[PDB]
């Protein structure tokens, strides 16, 4: 079939949903695409290059709240950005594990730059703007990885018995949205404080 980049990635995402990350391999991708392995090699050199590319495309395709809206508060931006990120990572099996193993590529350069500019434009130091954005990223990745790794390993004292029932009410969206507000407020308190002891 077609072996342009878009088509290769489509097939690889499809395979990722079928196999998970650990079971994703260039060999199986070749089969999915009806080609021989050396033909695939011309296009895709190894699994690492594949994964690097999938991370980028997962977000490009599905992380639709990369940038602040006109007039938007930084609180609101961070909330909307976290929810978008989380959505995009949940979209494919092992999506968060695919995203972990990567740094921003060129075309994300400009998206993350803007986000850091925006933070600095709202009273954050580069560093604190960065810590904020990274805390949100880490919290979100950590939380998605625990849904996704939960359900992957699948295939009592009373409070805990009940915590584990409450912790399975929904997918983790409640505990995530609650924590996200906590984190944002925490940032706000810090920003506000300037040099006052806080």
How far does Cα 168 stand from its chain's mean position? 21
Q: CA–CA separation, 192 vs 137, rounded Å?
A: 22
DSSP helix/strand/coil, 187: helix
DSSP state of 69: P
CB of 125 to ligand ITC, least distance (A): 15
- 73 contacts its own copies (rule: CB under 8 A): no
The listed partner (ligand ITC, its own copies, Cl ion, none) that binds 92, CB under 5 to 8 Å by sort, is none
- 155 contacts Cl ion (rule: CB under 5 A): no
What does the longest C-alpha to C-alpha distance in the chain come to?
65
Interaction mask 95-134, ligand ITC, x per CB under 6 A: --------xx---x--xx--x-----------------xx
Residues 123-182 that bind ligand ITC (CB under 6 A): 133-134, 136-137, 146
CB of 153 to its own copies, least distance (A): 5
Could you please report the per-residue DSSP string of 76-112?
HHHHHHHHHHHHHHHTSTTHHHHHHT----HHHHHHH
| Member of 10, 72, 128, 173 binding its own copies (CB under 8 A) | 128
How do the residues of the chain divide into helix, strand and coil, expressed in percent and rounded to 5?
Answer: 75, 0, 25
Q: Which is closer to its own copies, CB of 5 or CB of 48?
A: 48
Q: CA–CA separation, 167 vs 193, rounded Å?
A: 34
Is 7 in contact with 1 (CB distance < 8 Å)? yes
Residues near 118 by beta carbon (within 8 Å), at least 6 away in sequence: 67, 68, 74, 77
Interaction mask 48-77, ligand ITC, x per CB under 6 A: -----------x---x--x-----------
CB of 1 to its own copies, least distance (A): 29
| Member of 41, 166, 170, 192 binding its own copies (CB under 8 A) | 166
Residues in the site for ligand ITC, rule: CB under 6 A?
59, 63, 66, 81, 85, 103-104, 108, 111-112, 115, 133-134, 136-137, 146
Residues in the site for Cl ion, rule: CB under 5 A?
1-6, 46-47
């Amino acid at each position: 079939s077609r072996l342009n980049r878009e088509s290769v990635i489509d097939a690889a995402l499809e395979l990722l949903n079928e196999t998970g990350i650990d079971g994703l391999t260039t060999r199986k991708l070749a089969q999915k695409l009806g080609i021989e392995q050396p033909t695939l090699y011309w296009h895709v050199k190894n699994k690492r290059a594949l994964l690097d590319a999938l991370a980028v495309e997962i977000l490009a395709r599905h992380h639709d709240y990369s940038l602040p809206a006109a007039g938007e508060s930084w609180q609101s931006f961070l909330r909307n950005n976290a929810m978008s990120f989380r959505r995009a990572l949940l979209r494919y099996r092992d999506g968060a594990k695919v995203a972990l193993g990567t740094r921003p590529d060129e075309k994300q350069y400009d998206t993350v730059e803007t986000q850091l500019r925006f933070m600095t434009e709202n009273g954050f130091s580069l560093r604190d703007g960065l810590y904020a954005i990274s805390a949100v990223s880490h919290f979100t990745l950590g939380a998605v990885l625990e849904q996704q790794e939960h359900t992957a390993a699948l295939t009592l004292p009373p409070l805990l018995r009940e915590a584990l029932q409450i912790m399975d009410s929904d997918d983790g969206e409640q505990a995530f949205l609650h924590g996200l507000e906590s984190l944002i407020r925490g940032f706000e308190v810090q920003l506000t404080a300037l040099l006052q002891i806080v």
